[PDB]
Amino acid sequence: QVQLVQSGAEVRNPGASVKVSCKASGYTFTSYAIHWVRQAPGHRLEWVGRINTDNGNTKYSQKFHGRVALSRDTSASTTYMDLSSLNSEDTAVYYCARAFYYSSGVMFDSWGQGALVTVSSAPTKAPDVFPIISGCRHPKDNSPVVLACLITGYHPTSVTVTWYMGTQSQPQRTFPEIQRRDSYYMTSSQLSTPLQQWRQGEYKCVVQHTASKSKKEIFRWPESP
Amino acid sequence: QVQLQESGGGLVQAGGSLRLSCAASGFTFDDYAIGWFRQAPGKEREGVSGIRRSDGSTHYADSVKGRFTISTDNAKNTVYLQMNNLKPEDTAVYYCAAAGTPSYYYTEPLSLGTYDYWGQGTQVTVSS
Amino acid sequence: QSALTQPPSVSGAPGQRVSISCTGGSSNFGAGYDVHWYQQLPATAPKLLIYGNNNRPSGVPDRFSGSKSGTSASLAITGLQAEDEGDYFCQSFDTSLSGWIFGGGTKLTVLGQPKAAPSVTLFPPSSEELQANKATLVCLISDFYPGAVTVAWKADSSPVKAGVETTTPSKQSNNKYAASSYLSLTPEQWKSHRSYSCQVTHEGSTVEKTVAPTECS
Ligand code: NA
């Protein structure tokens, strides 16, 4: 079916530029126009610009003052948005959408998943991951064991956590990410099913942080202190 | 900063004539069609006539066919709307609009969804 | 006006009806440009819900209808479902700006959902964290509804406010709310006190969990 898939999230220093891609599939790419819309936190959707996938001509929102440029590669079935001179108000999810013509105004019948662009002066830093546990590693009082991983000191958001019992993925509980007093972020991921006993290394939390190109695994909860 | 400036409006007697002009400026591309829309008091904007600048092809609404003549002068970036045998029902605010996507103009030359650049409009009154 | 105005939020009971107004101006709705409606569920891309004032594309149930008077549109939803929760945007084109416009969006909350007590687990500082000269108490709060919770910390029996960071609750993919509270301590604070406690209040009930430095031997 008609599908728009965009590149991943990006983080940028203020005054830099970012190039977001949007690959189209499931239909004739050059037979439909592609628009770009952004969504800032606590803001409405804001139209960014249009580009004809055939002849490549563009039309931009005057609110951006020449800072946004749109391009397309018909061989790759992909449109690109380049937003230069980034500022803090440019932190937003950038969608691409297909223009379906309608005599009383075009519609956006297919939307891409969006790409988060974060504009920050704070450094990018990989997370520290700590194995945390409730009920002690080897309970003597029949208490259930709860495993979780404390994920702290990273920037920017976000991190992705998965749990594994061997190679089998395991259900988890997700929690919000909060910005610490030191402008860094912290969060937690809890293994959903309580435990009793397990061989050392049976369970693990895998914490991916694309911004820092780092993936950290924790597969050992040491003898209880 | 695309601009579309209408001119030539005013007040005429039934059966009279008027020539409207739309001065275009700020275009970073030149494959665009120019349309003329009119909005009578308490109504919507309806397509009167349009012209593709490169193709030179014109279209007209049935209510104005024969009486109205749209012509382009790409050297001056101006599109003219010659209006003859004006009727009181022709009274409206006339707008000139540009179509940035040529595929839309080939499908619907006189539909609002075809034009994504718009001028401020000029008033035309035909008395009796 | 050269923009579309929607109410910030609209709430309704399941099986009941709700209406979302989207008012514009002469330069968009009044010029003849129609309204399009988009539905954006939590953590997903917007989806075309209604186009051309009152038309539904393939996949949209009859429970969604729309009207437009040329200056004010309306998206009505009959028989509210829990899955209807999300943000609903209207959209048009403005001739005075020569650009496409979107409404501010309306958050649809479906009331009457089944209430759920929070599942609270309090984690002491990990040995690894203590070896980094840092100590964080982790109070994980999951699987509750509605989202309002209050978290309070106690060292022994006395309240603690310094070093506390409590997340705003938010719905997770399980359609339940989750939250967290972190008590940042020095290793000396953690070892000196007899115990620390996380107190979670939620809809007329309070749950308290307690950890101690020597509870594991
Ligand atoms: Na693995």
Residue numbers in the entry:
A (entry chain H): 1 to 225
B (entry chain N): 2 to 129
C (entry chain L): 1 to 217
The publication says:
Human anti-Phl p 7 antibodies recognize the timothy grass (Phleum pratense) pollen allergen Phl p 7. The HAPPI1 antibody toolkit shares an identical VH domain and light chain but differs in constant region heavy chain use. Here, we introduce the anti-IgD nanobody 072 (aδNb072), an orthosteric inhibitor of Phl p 7, for which we have determined the crystal structure in complex with the HAPPID1 Fab. Nanobodies (Nbs) are derived from heavy-chain-only antibodies in camelids, which, unlike classical antibodies, contain their antigenic recognition potential within a single VH domain (also termed VHH).
The crystal structure of the aδNb072/HAPPID1 Fab complex was solved at 2.1 Å resolution, providing a high-resolution view of the interaction between these two binding partners. The interface between aδNb072 and the HAPPID1 Fab buries a surface area of ~840 Å2, of which most (~58%) of the binding surface is with the VH domain. At the interface with the VH domain, CDR1 (aδNb072) contacts CDRH2 (Fab), CDR3 (aδNb072) packs against CDRH2 (Fab) and also forms extensive contacts with CDRH3 (Fab), while a minor contact is formed with CDRH1 (Fab). A notable feature of the interface is insertion of Thr102, Tyr105 and Asp117 (aδNb072, CDR3) in a depression created by CDRH1-3, which is bordered at one end by the VL domain. CDR3 from aδNb072 forms a number of hydrogen bonds with CDRH2 and CDRH3 from the Fab: Gly101 (aδNb072)–Asn52 (Fab, CDRH2), Thr102 (aδNb072)–Asn52 (Fab, CDRH2), Gly114 (aδNb072)–Ser103 (Fab, CDRH3) and Thr115 (aδNb072)–Tyr101 (Fab, CDRH3). Moreover, the interface includes a salt bridge between Asp117 (aδNb072) and Arg50 (Fab, CDRH2). At the interface with the VL domain, CDR3 and FR residues (aδNb072) contact CDRL1 (Fab); here, Leu113 (aδNb072, CDR3) packs against Tyr33 (Fab, CDRL1) and hydrogen bonds form between Gln40 (aδNb072, FR) and Gly30 (Fab, CDRL1), Arg46 (aδNb072, FR) and Ala31 (Fab, CDRL1), and Tyr116 (aδNb072, CDR3 mainchain) and Tyr33 (Fab, CDRL1). Comparisons of the aδNb072/HAPPID1 Fab and Phl p 7/HAPPIG11 Fab complexes reveal substantial overlap between the aδNb072 and Phl p 7 binding sites. Approximately 70% of the Phl p 7 paratope on the VH domain, and over 80% of the aδNb072 binding site, overlap. We observed that aδNb072 bound to the HAPPID1 Fab with low nanomolar affinity and also bound the HAPPIE1 Fab. aδNb072 did not bind to the HAPPID2 Fab.
